[PDB]
From a paper:
In this study we show that [name], a protein secreted by [name], can bind Fe3+ and Cu2+. We demonstrate that exogenously added [name] reduces the toxicity of H2O2, probably by preventing the Fenton reaction. Our work establishes that members of the Ibp family exhibit the same fold as SBP proteins albeit with significant modifications making of [name] structure a prototype for this family. The reduced pathogenicities of [name] [name] and Botrytis cinerea ibp mutants reveal the importance of this conserved protein in the infectious process deployed by necrotrophic microbes probably because of their impaired capacity to detoxify ROS produced during infection.
In the case of iron, the protein was co-crystallized with FeCl3 and the structure of iron bound [name] was solved at a resolution of 1.8 Å. The structures of [name] and Fe-[name] were nearly identical and no important structural modification was observed. As suspected from our previous analysis, the metal did not bind at the canonical SBP cluster D protein substrate-binding pocket. Instead, the iron atom was located near the dimer interface, at the entry of tunnel identified previously. Nevertheless, the conservation of the residues involved in iron-binding in [name] strongly suggests that the binding site identified here accomplishes a common, essential function in all members of this family.
Residue numbers in the entry:
A (entry chain A), B (entry chain C): 28 to 372
Amino acid sequence: ATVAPDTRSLDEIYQSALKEGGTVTVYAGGDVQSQQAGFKQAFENRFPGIKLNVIVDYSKYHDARIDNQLATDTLIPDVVQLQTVQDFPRWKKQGVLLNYKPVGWDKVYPEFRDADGAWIGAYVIAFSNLVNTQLLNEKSWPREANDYLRPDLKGNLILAYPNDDDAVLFWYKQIVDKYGWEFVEKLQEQDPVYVRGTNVPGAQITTGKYSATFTSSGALVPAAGSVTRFVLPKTDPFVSWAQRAAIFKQAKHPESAKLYLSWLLDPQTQTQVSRMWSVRTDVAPPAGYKHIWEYSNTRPQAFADFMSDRGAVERFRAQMSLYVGEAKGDPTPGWLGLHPEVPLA
Amino acid sequence: ATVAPDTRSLDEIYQSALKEGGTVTVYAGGDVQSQQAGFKQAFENRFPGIKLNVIVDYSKYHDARIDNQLATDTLIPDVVQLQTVQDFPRWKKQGVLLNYKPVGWDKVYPEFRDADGAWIGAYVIAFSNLVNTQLLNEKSWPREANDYLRPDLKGNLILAYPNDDDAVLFWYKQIVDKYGWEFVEKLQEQDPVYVRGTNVPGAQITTGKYSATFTSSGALVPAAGSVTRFVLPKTDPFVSWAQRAAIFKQAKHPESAKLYLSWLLDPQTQTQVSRMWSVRTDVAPPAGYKHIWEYSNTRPQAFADFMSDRGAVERFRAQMSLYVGEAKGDPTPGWLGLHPEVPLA
Ligand SMILES: [Fe+3]
Ligand SMILES: [Fe+3]
């Protein structure tokens, strides 16, 4: 189907969605269910009568889960949203995605949406420096990769496993490109603590157990009283991308899915719920920042290009494994199995 | 450089190799060091004064290891020998392999050798049924995949993790192609015990802890008094391939490396040391068997084709992981790190 952007108001879509039973099911990529709590609360407050049944798991498990459900005709979710961005052109070509251009589609940065409406970039995520501002004064915030190699940061770093998350991995890819394998060798001499779940480094830095990490997302607008700060490099690369979302052709609740995607693109959602950059050209960067496509030291398309060559990703991942070891510990979302219909209890 | 098969006798190559210091270092794919003990013993007994410094690790770790050593100019081994067969044309194209047609090159089945001498099929491995013949009479040996679903085998199977070894994985790929995902579903209801290391199921079947496994190698001619038997299906597919070996262009001991490759193809090695099929057309299979390329229910090239598409391999691996869980336990070869120069202590 050839479609035009939805011309309905959010409330008009909501009236249609209400007739579908009161729930929309989203398989969302992430580390822990709480990372989507803010979206769920905001959505459900905005739309009484419709539950956002968002279920969080690592994107590399959700995409497999979806492929298997499609193979076995047991598809559960209405919507998929993941950082494994290469899946979306593949699912599109497979014919399993509903072409839908949500409200505001015309204002999305072209790179951040499919031309036919098969998928949409929902919001921007970036991985870079997160520092404890009480442990480190501003003049000593590590911002470039090699700052993390200075003597006083030995034993004070906590890092997400790069062999457990390809967005984390891509940070290392860009840095090895620039500084060589020697960076990775010297980094290990800092006795970093590696953990699964990209939420965990920020959590432990917040409680003052570690001082900094260079592969974390975070609020561009810190809360008053915050003891952490997301800080971009002055010159070194950082990782960024638009999290991709799509509606399945055979979704049981298509209008509820449309409501969800249109709500995600709404300027208020983009500025007050999403905590980093917007995918829209008519939404102002938070004061002090530029649009994500205006930074010379990141390139969201580069992450997409990276993710499209699985052999190249695999070969780089396995080499990183030899430096950091196998990814220890349980997966942070818990084990959802083949057919989760609700979040883990 | 265009080369012809080595026209020297083994003894001639051996005289040259003796001048190089008495060691040849081989990075060999495998689950545990003891799997190469037979080769090591036979080689060193045939060529006093030359040590086969064969170092065993999972192929998926050795190839990354080699890539990183190449990238950092820290290459250690003279010879690489792995099941990750797709690595060999890539290393060929990178220019890091020494073109060398060993003695007997002309008699290697064409599919099992590089046209230029960049690599050679060293010996044939197959994964299929291994049964305990004391626990199970012949009429009840499971041979077909669906035999393993019978009631009395519940709690009585031990299986290599398919998400820890791609040759193990390919067995499942072929069986899902034929029987669908339902086989994998029903298999989990049999409560199989999964383990890392393809040696481990056999080891535990041999002591009578389990009755059978369907992804193991084994002797085509069982030893006198054996309590296990390697048995092919009557009709279902099984996995087979020629393990590939190559000499590095910058091998420190090239004549010793050539001795090793020529020794691999020597009739005595192909008939008395290698325990499954030979890569040579002029080596008769044991009675009861045909050449590995004459079975309609296996195809060595299908495994090579499989392994060449890393994205397809990844997507199938991740789905299998949803059924069997993450691969638990330590890696069976131990942790060798970036630069092993000798086997682990
Ligand atoms: Fe990922
Ligand atoms: Fe493998």
